[PDB]
Amino acid sequence: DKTFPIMLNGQVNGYACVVGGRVFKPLHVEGRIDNEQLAAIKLKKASIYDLEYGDVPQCMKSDTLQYTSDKPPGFYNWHHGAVQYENNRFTVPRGVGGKGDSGRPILDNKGRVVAIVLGGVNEGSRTALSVVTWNQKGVTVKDTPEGSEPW
Amino acid sequence: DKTFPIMLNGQVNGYACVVGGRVFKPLHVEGRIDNEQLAAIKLKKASIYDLEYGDVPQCMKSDTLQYTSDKPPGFYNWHHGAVQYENNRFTVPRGVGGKGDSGRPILDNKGRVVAIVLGGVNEGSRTALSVVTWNQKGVTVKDTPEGSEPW
Amino acid sequence: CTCVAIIMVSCVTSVWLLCRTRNLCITPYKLAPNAQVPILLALLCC
């Protein structure tokens, strides 16, 4: 797995992570990408999408496995423990999921990155997030609960 | 099983292999076929297809069993070990699948030659190949990943 | 003389194109040796 922080002013401001099929960088924030191999790659950002085009030589291509439909409620391994929910983002503990750690992938226990967080700072006594994943049939759609800011 | 190297200048340059139903010779490369029984057979090559017509007397006809649809990801016995993949050609080890050994059949563990390699020298830190087999309903179609040269 | 020459050359060009198109129509029968489902087209398949 290659999940890389983004270098801004010599400190971490983002967190770039490569995914199956295409290499991914969260283009919501800026900062020089730490990896030198990615340091010479053109940027392809859409109006609302903040994703890097996949231009890694196909030796290390598809570092991960993408995620299909049929979301279970079960455990998804997160950087800070497992997450367990199905209707929307898991009720992450308070304090966790704040700010400054943009671009963190949530993966299945089977190695299938279910979604990519793009904010969702607080959602009450619990907290869900604003993320993007396949819609129902494999459509890269973002869902943003109200009160969502990059985390 | 009758898999035969092709004799060019008295050394192996290709590898002819007979299949169920029809006798097969990879016509991509040249060289006198080692087998004398095949030495007196007319050649039937298409624009992109490099296959020999089946003109062996029907005593040794259908040396193998052809391969149907529903590709499993499981093990297929290859000349250099088993191969395990479903989306495309298996991630063969680096160094293996180079050049000079054109015309090598990949078989099912059940004796069903899933496909015929026609190149695919390198595909990165792993390697897939350019092969031909039934498409979905039994159609002899070739798939060529980018960066494919005869192996 | 000119008319017979031009009509015969037109006809022979047409028949060459006929042969080439026939070759192209032969090409898909690459699937024929595969012993597969009939296609139900202008040519016969058991």
mmCIF file of all heavy atoms in Angstrom, chain B residues 4-17 25-35 98-104 117-119 149-151:
data_model
loop_
_atom_site.group_PDB
_atom_site.id
_atom_site.type_symbol
_atom_site.label_atom_id
_atom_site.label_comp_id
_atom_site.label_asym_id
_atom_site.label_seq_id
_atom_site.Cartn_x
_atom_site.Cartn_y
_atom_site.Cartn_z
ATOM 1 N N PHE B 4 4.808 -28.946 -30.492
ATOM 2 C CA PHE B 4 6.036 -29.143 -31.242
ATOM 3 C C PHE B 4 6.729 -27.816 -31.499
ATOM 4 O O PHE B 4 6.090 -26.856 -31.938
ATOM 5 C CB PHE B 4 5.752 -29.842 -32.570
ATOM 6 C CG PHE B 4 6.707 -30.951 -32.875
ATOM 7 C CD1 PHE B 4 7.603 -31.382 -31.914
ATOM 8 C CD2 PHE B 4 6.718 -31.561 -34.113
ATOM 9 C CE1 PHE B 4 8.491 -32.402 -32.178
ATOM 10 C CE2 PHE B 4 7.597 -32.588 -34.384
ATOM 11 C CZ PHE B 4 8.489 -33.007 -33.417
ATOM 12 N N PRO B 5 8.021 -27.713 -31.214
ATOM 13 C CA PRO B 5 8.771 -26.535 -31.646
ATOM 14 C C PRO B 5 8.846 -26.469 -33.159
ATOM 15 O O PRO B 5 8.724 -27.471 -33.868
ATOM 16 C CB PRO B 5 10.156 -26.750 -31.031
ATOM 17 C CG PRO B 5 9.914 -27.639 -29.869
ATOM 18 C CD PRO B 5 8.813 -28.561 -30.308
ATOM 19 N N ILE B 6 9.037 -25.254 -33.652
ATOM 20 C CA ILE B 6 9.180 -25.011 -35.079
ATOM 21 C C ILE B 6 10.667 -24.982 -35.399
ATOM 22 O O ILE B 6 11.448 -24.330 -34.697
ATOM 23 C CB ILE B 6 8.494 -23.702 -35.489
ATOM 24 C CG1 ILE B 6 7.040 -23.708 -35.015
ATOM 25 C CG2 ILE B 6 8.566 -23.518 -36.990
ATOM 26 C CD1 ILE B 6 6.332 -22.393 -35.215
ATOM 27 N N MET B 7 11.063 -25.704 -36.440
ATOM 28 C CA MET B 7 12.468 -25.802 -36.814
ATOM 29 C C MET B 7 12.808 -24.687 -37.793
ATOM 30 O O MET B 7 12.305 -24.661 -38.922
ATOM 31 C CB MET B 7 12.776 -27.175 -37.406
ATOM 32 C CG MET B 7 12.792 -28.283 -36.377
ATOM 33 S SD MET B 7 13.863 -27.899 -34.976
ATOM 34 C CE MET B 7 12.655 -27.486 -33.717
ATOM 35 N N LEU B 8 13.652 -23.761 -37.355
ATOM 36 C CA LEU B 8 14.245 -22.755 -38.218
ATOM 37 C C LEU B 8 15.753 -22.810 -38.048
ATOM 38 O O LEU B 8 16.256 -22.678 -36.927
ATOM 39 C CB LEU B 8 13.718 -21.362 -37.885
ATOM 40 C CG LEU B 8 14.255 -20.229 -38.754
ATOM 41 C CD1 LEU B 8 14.054 -20.555 -40.222
ATOM 42 C CD2 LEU B 8 13.567 -18.926 -38.396
ATOM 43 N N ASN B 9 16.467 -23.011 -39.155
ATOM 44 C CA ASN B 9 17.924 -23.129 -39.168
ATOM 45 C C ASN B 9 18.426 -24.229 -38.242
ATOM 46 O O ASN B 9 19.579 -24.196 -37.800
ATOM 47 C CB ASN B 9 18.592 -21.796 -38.818
ATOM 48 C CG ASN B 9 18.184 -20.680 -39.753
ATOM 49 O OD1 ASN B 9 17.559 -19.705 -39.337
ATOM 50 N ND2 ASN B 9 18.536 -20.815 -41.026
ATOM 51 N N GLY B 10 17.584 -25.217 -37.952
ATOM 52 C CA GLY B 10 17.972 -26.287 -37.056
ATOM 53 C C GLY B 10 17.916 -25.929 -35.589
ATOM 54 O O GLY B 10 18.512 -26.630 -34.767
ATOM 55 N N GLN B 11 17.214 -24.857 -35.234
ATOM 56 C CA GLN B 11 16.993 -24.521 -33.837
ATOM 57 C C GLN B 11 15.557 -24.060 -33.661
ATOM 58 O O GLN B 11 14.882 -23.671 -34.619
ATOM 59 C CB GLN B 11 17.956 -23.441 -33.328
ATOM 60 C CG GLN B 11 17.696 -22.059 -33.883
ATOM 61 C CD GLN B 11 18.440 -21.814 -35.172
ATOM 62 O OE1 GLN B 11 19.227 -22.648 -35.612
ATOM 63 N NE2 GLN B 11 18.198 -20.664 -35.788
ATOM 64 N N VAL B 12 15.097 -24.110 -32.413
ATOM 65 C CA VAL B 12 13.718 -23.765 -32.107
ATOM 66 C C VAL B 12 13.524 -22.265 -32.260
ATOM 67 O O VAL B 12 14.243 -21.463 -31.652
ATOM 68 C CB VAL B 12 13.352 -24.227 -30.690
ATOM 69 C CG1 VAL B 12 11.930 -23.814 -30.351
ATOM 70 C CG2 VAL B 12 13.535 -25.729 -30.559
ATOM 71 N N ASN B 13 12.551 -21.880 -33.074
ATOM 72 C CA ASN B 13 12.114 -20.497 -33.165
ATOM 73 C C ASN B 13 10.655 -20.315 -32.792
ATOM 74 O O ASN B 13 10.287 -19.252 -32.290
ATOM 75 C CB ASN B 13 12.332 -19.952 -34.580
ATOM 76 C CG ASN B 13 11.410 -20.591 -35.592
ATOM 77 O OD1 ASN B 13 11.079 -21.771 -35.490
ATOM 78 N ND2 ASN B 13 10.986 -19.812 -36.573
ATOM 79 N N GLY B 14 9.818 -21.323 -33.033
ATOM 80 C CA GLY B 14 8.428 -21.291 -32.634
ATOM 81 C C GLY B 14 8.058 -22.558 -31.885
ATOM 82 O O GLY B 14 8.920 -23.348 -31.494
ATOM 83 N N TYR B 15 6.752 -22.725 -31.684
ATOM 84 C CA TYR B 15 6.253 -23.872 -30.924
ATOM 85 C C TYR B 15 4.834 -24.170 -31.413
ATOM 86 O O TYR B 15 3.871 -23.532 -30.986
ATOM 87 C CB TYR B 15 6.297 -23.586 -29.431
ATOM 88 C CG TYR B 15 6.249 -24.807 -28.551
ATOM 89 C CD1 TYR B 15 7.196 -25.806 -28.675
ATOM 90 C CD2 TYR B 15 5.271 -24.949 -27.578
ATOM 91 C CE1 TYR B 15 7.164 -26.920 -27.872
ATOM 92 C CE2 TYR B 15 5.233 -26.063 -26.765
ATOM 93 C CZ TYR B 15 6.185 -27.048 -26.920
ATOM 94 O OH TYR B 15 6.167 -28.169 -26.123
ATOM 95 N N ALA B 16 4.721 -25.130 -32.326
ATOM 96 C CA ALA B 16 3.420 -25.529 -32.842
ATOM 97 C C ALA B 16 2.756 -26.525 -31.898
ATOM 98 O O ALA B 16 3.404 -27.417 -31.347
ATOM 99 C CB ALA B 16 3.555 -26.140 -34.235
ATOM 100 N N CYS B 17 1.449 -26.364 -31.714
ATOM 101 C CA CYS B 17 0.682 -27.217 -30.818
ATOM 102 C C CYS B 17 -0.657 -27.548 -31.456
ATOM 103 O O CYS B 17 -1.347 -26.653 -31.951
ATOM 104 C CB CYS B 17 0.476 -26.537 -29.463
ATOM 105 S SG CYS B 17 -0.175 -24.858 -29.588
ATOM 106 N N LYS B 25 -1.067 -24.237 -35.786
ATOM 107 C CA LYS B 25 0.313 -23.791 -35.875
ATOM 108 C C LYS B 25 0.321 -22.272 -35.828
ATOM 109 O O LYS B 25 -0.376 -21.623 -36.616
ATOM 110 C CB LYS B 25 0.983 -24.300 -37.153
ATOM 111 C CG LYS B 25 2.508 -24.153 -37.191
ATOM 112 C CD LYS B 25 2.949 -22.748 -37.583
ATOM 113 C CE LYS B 25 4.367 -22.725 -38.112
ATOM 114 N NZ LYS B 25 4.827 -21.329 -38.354
ATOM 115 N N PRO B 26 1.097 -21.675 -34.934
ATOM 116 C CA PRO B 26 1.169 -20.211 -34.889
ATOM 117 C C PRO B 26 1.908 -19.667 -36.094
ATOM 118 O O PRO B 26 3.135 -19.765 -36.181
ATOM 119 C CB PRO B 26 1.933 -19.931 -33.587
ATOM 120 C CG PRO B 26 1.918 -21.231 -32.831
ATOM 121 C CD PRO B 26 1.872 -22.304 -33.856
ATOM 122 N N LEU B 27 1.169 -19.079 -37.025
ATOM 123 C CA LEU B 27 1.748 -18.618 -38.276
ATOM 124 C C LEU B 27 2.354 -17.225 -38.166
ATOM 125 O O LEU B 27 2.749 -16.655 -39.190
ATOM 126 C CB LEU B 27 0.689 -18.649 -39.379
ATOM 127 C CG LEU B 27 -0.121 -19.940 -39.515
ATOM 128 C CD1 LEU B 27 -1.138 -19.812 -40.624
ATOM 129 C CD2 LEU B 27 0.783 -21.120 -39.763
ATOM 130 N N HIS B 28 2.434 -16.667 -36.957
ATOM 131 C CA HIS B 28 3.085 -15.373 -36.787
ATOM 132 C C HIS B 28 4.559 -15.447 -37.160
ATOM 133 O O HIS B 28 5.092 -14.537 -37.805
ATOM 134 C CB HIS B 28 2.929 -14.884 -35.352
ATOM 135 C CG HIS B 28 3.888 -13.797 -34.986
ATOM 136 N ND1 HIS B 28 5.049 -14.036 -34.284
ATOM 137 C CD2 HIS B 28 3.869 -12.468 -35.240
ATOM 138 C CE1 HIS B 28 5.701 -12.900 -34.117
ATOM 139 N NE2 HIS B 28 5.005 -11.932 -34.685
ATOM 140 N N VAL B 29 5.233 -16.516 -36.756
ATOM 141 C CA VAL B 29 6.627 -16.736 -37.101
ATOM 142 C C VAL B 29 6.690 -17.794 -38.194
ATOM 143 O O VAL B 29 5.702 -18.460 -38.508
ATOM 144 C CB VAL B 29 7.474 -17.152 -35.884
ATOM 145 C CG1 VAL B 29 7.466 -16.065 -34.828
ATOM 146 C CG2 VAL B 29 6.968 -18.469 -35.313
ATOM 147 N N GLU B 30 7.872 -17.950 -38.772
ATOM 148 C CA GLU B 30 8.120 -18.906 -39.840
ATOM 149 C C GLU B 30 9.136 -19.940 -39.371
ATOM 150 O O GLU B 30 9.593 -19.926 -38.227
ATOM 151 C CB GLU B 30 8.603 -18.200 -41.110
ATOM 152 C CG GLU B 30 9.962 -17.531 -40.985
ATOM 153 C CD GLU B 30 9.906 -16.212 -40.242
ATOM 154 O OE1 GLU B 30 8.801 -15.804 -39.824
ATOM 155 O OE2 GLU B 30 10.970 -15.580 -40.076
ATOM 156 N N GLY B 31 9.479 -20.850 -40.271
ATOM 157 C CA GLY B 31 10.398 -21.930 -39.963
ATOM 158 C C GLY B 31 9.723 -23.234 -40.327
ATOM 159 O O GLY B 31 8.504 -23.386 -40.212
ATOM 160 N N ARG B 32 10.525 -24.191 -40.782
ATOM 161 C CA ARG B 32 9.979 -25.478 -41.181
ATOM 162 C C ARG B 32 9.476 -26.224 -39.950
ATOM 163 O O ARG B 32 10.187 -26.346 -38.950
ATOM 164 C CB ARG B 32 11.045 -26.285 -41.922
ATOM 165 C CG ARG B 32 10.544 -27.530 -42.638
ATOM 166 C CD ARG B 32 10.713 -28.758 -41.772
ATOM 167 N NE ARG B 32 12.017 -28.774 -41.120
ATOM 168 C CZ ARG B 32 12.380 -29.658 -40.197
ATOM 169 N NH1 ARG B 32 11.533 -30.602 -39.812
ATOM 170 N NH2 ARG B 32 13.588 -29.595 -39.660
ATOM 171 N N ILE B 33 8.237 -26.708 -40.017
ATOM 172 C CA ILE B 33 7.659 -27.428 -38.891
ATOM 173 C C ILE B 33 8.361 -28.769 -38.740
ATOM 174 O O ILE B 33 8.562 -29.498 -39.720
ATOM 175 C CB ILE B 33 6.146 -27.600 -39.083
ATOM 176 C CG1 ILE B 33 5.577 -28.529 -38.008
ATOM 177 C CG2 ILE B 33 5.833 -28.121 -40.479
ATOM 178 C CD1 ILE B 33 5.784 -28.024 -36.591
ATOM 179 N N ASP B 34 8.727 -29.105 -37.502
ATOM 180 C CA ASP B 34 9.513 -30.311 -37.264
ATOM 181 C C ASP B 34 8.766 -31.565 -37.706
ATOM 182 O O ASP B 34 9.367 -32.481 -38.279
ATOM 183 C CB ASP B 34 9.889 -30.394 -35.783
ATOM 184 C CG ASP B 34 10.956 -31.436 -35.504
ATOM 185 O OD1 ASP B 34 10.796 -32.601 -35.927
ATOM 186 O OD2 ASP B 34 11.963 -31.087 -34.853
ATOM 187 N N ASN B 35 7.460 -31.622 -37.464
ATOM 188 C CA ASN B 35 6.707 -32.839 -37.728
ATOM 189 C C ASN B 35 6.572 -33.085 -39.226
ATOM 190 O O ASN B 35 6.183 -32.191 -39.984
ATOM 191 C CB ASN B 35 5.328 -32.756 -37.086
ATOM 192 C CG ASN B 35 4.645 -34.097 -37.020
ATOM 193 O OD1 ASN B 35 4.051 -34.547 -37.994
ATOM 194 N ND2 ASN B 35 4.733 -34.751 -35.869
ATOM 195 N N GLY B 98 9.212 -13.901 -21.857
ATOM 196 C CA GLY B 98 10.048 -12.944 -22.549
ATOM 197 C C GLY B 98 9.842 -13.028 -24.050
ATOM 198 O O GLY B 98 8.847 -12.515 -24.567
ATOM 199 N N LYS B 99 10.774 -13.658 -24.760
ATOM 200 C CA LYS B 99 10.654 -13.829 -26.196
ATOM 201 C C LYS B 99 11.174 -15.198 -26.607
ATOM 202 O O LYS B 99 11.753 -15.933 -25.806
ATOM 203 C CB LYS B 99 11.410 -12.745 -26.966
ATOM 204 C CG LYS B 99 10.578 -11.521 -27.276
ATOM 205 C CD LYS B 99 10.827 -11.001 -28.685
ATOM 206 C CE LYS B 99 10.373 -11.994 -29.747
ATOM 207 N NZ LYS B 99 11.443 -12.951 -30.144
ATOM 208 N N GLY B 100 10.938 -15.538 -27.879
ATOM 209 C CA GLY B 100 11.509 -16.710 -28.502
ATOM 210 C C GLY B 100 10.749 -18.002 -28.296
ATOM 211 O O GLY B 100 11.136 -19.028 -28.871
ATOM 212 N N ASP B 101 9.684 -17.987 -27.506
ATOM 213 C CA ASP B 101 8.931 -19.200 -27.225
ATOM 214 C C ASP B 101 7.489 -19.031 -27.693
ATOM 215 O O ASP B 101 6.541 -19.332 -26.961
ATOM 216 C CB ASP B 101 9.039 -19.528 -25.733
ATOM 217 C CG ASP B 101 8.324 -20.811 -25.349
ATOM 218 O OD1 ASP B 101 8.647 -21.879 -25.909
ATOM 219 O OD2 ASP B 101 7.431 -20.732 -24.485
ATOM 220 N N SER B 102 7.327 -18.537 -28.921
ATOM 221 C CA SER B 102 6.008 -18.252 -29.473
ATOM 222 C C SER B 102 5.184 -19.525 -29.595
ATOM 223 O O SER B 102 5.714 -20.612 -29.829
ATOM 224 C CB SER B 102 6.145 -17.584 -30.844
ATOM 225 O OG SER B 102 6.868 -18.404 -31.740
ATOM 226 N N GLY B 103 3.873 -19.380 -29.426
ATOM 227 C CA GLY B 103 2.964 -20.493 -29.617
ATOM 228 C C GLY B 103 2.939 -21.464 -28.459
ATOM 229 O O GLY B 103 3.282 -22.639 -28.611
ATOM 230 N N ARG B 104 2.524 -20.992 -27.289
ATOM 231 C CA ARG B 104 2.453 -21.835 -26.104
ATOM 232 C C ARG B 104 1.028 -21.812 -25.574
ATOM 233 O O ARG B 104 0.503 -20.727 -25.254
ATOM 234 C CB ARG B 104 3.453 -21.372 -25.049
ATOM 235 C CG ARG B 104 4.800 -22.039 -25.163
ATOM 236 C CD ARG B 104 4.832 -23.340 -24.387
ATOM 237 N NE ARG B 104 6.139 -23.984 -24.450
ATOM 238 C CZ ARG B 104 7.170 -23.658 -23.679
ATOM 239 N NH1 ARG B 104 7.054 -22.686 -22.784
ATOM 240 N NH2 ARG B 104 8.320 -24.303 -23.806
ATOM 241 N N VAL B 117 -1.363 -18.007 -26.336
ATOM 242 C CA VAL B 117 -0.591 -16.779 -26.232
ATOM 243 C C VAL B 117 -0.139 -16.354 -27.616
ATOM 244 O O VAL B 117 0.191 -17.188 -28.468
ATOM 245 C CB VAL B 117 0.608 -16.960 -25.285
ATOM 246 C CG1 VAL B 117 0.136 -17.482 -23.936
ATOM 247 C CG2 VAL B 117 1.661 -17.889 -25.890
ATOM 248 N N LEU B 118 -0.181 -15.052 -27.863
ATOM 249 C CA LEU B 118 0.362 -14.483 -29.085
ATOM 250 C C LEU B 118 1.136 -13.214 -28.762
ATOM 251 O O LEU B 118 1.044 -12.208 -29.469
ATOM 252 C CB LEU B 118 -0.736 -14.216 -30.112
ATOM 253 C CG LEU B 118 -0.254 -14.078 -31.557
ATOM 254 C CD1 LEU B 118 0.606 -15.273 -31.954
ATOM 255 C CD2 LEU B 118 -1.420 -13.908 -32.519
ATOM 256 N N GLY B 119 1.874 -13.230 -27.663
ATOM 257 C CA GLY B 119 2.696 -12.108 -27.278
ATOM 258 C C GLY B 119 2.344 -11.621 -25.895
ATOM 259 O O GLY B 119 1.726 -12.330 -25.095
ATOM 260 N N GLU B 149 4.380 -7.845 -27.299
ATOM 261 C CA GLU B 149 5.218 -8.350 -28.371
ATOM 262 C C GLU B 149 5.293 -9.862 -28.244
ATOM 263 O O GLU B 149 5.133 -10.397 -27.143
ATOM 264 C CB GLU B 149 6.626 -7.742 -28.307
ATOM 265 C CG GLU B 149 7.040 -6.968 -29.549
ATOM 266 C CD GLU B 149 8.181 -7.635 -30.291
ATOM 267 O OE1 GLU B 149 8.853 -8.509 -29.699
ATOM 268 O OE2 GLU B 149 8.406 -7.287 -31.469
ATOM 269 N N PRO B 150 5.514 -10.578 -29.347
ATOM 270 C CA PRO B 150 5.494 -12.047 -29.287
ATOM 271 C C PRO B 150 6.487 -12.580 -28.265
ATOM 272 O O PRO B 150 7.601 -12.070 -28.132
ATOM 273 C CB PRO B 150 5.869 -12.465 -30.714
ATOM 274 C CG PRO B 150 6.521 -11.256 -31.312
ATOM 275 C CD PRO B 150 5.790 -10.101 -30.713
ATOM 276 N N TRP B 151 6.054 -13.586 -27.511
ATOM 277 C CA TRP B 151 6.904 -14.209 -26.504
ATOM 278 C C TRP B 151 7.171 -15.657 -26.878
ATOM 279 O O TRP B 151 6.248 -16.472 -26.891
ATOM 280 C CB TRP B 151 6.262 -14.096 -25.114
ATOM 281 C CG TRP B 151 6.279 -15.353 -24.269
ATOM 282 C CD1 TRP B 151 5.194 -15.995 -23.751
ATOM 283 C CD2 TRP B 151 7.429 -16.109 -23.847
ATOM 284 N NE1 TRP B 151 5.593 -17.100 -23.035
ATOM 285 C CE2 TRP B 151 6.958 -17.193 -23.083
ATOM 286 C CE3 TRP B 151 8.802 -15.982 -24.057
ATOM 287 C CZ2 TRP B 151 7.814 -18.136 -22.518
ATOM 288 C CZ3 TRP B 151 9.653 -16.912 -23.489
ATOM 289 C CH2 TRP B 151 9.155 -17.977 -22.728
#
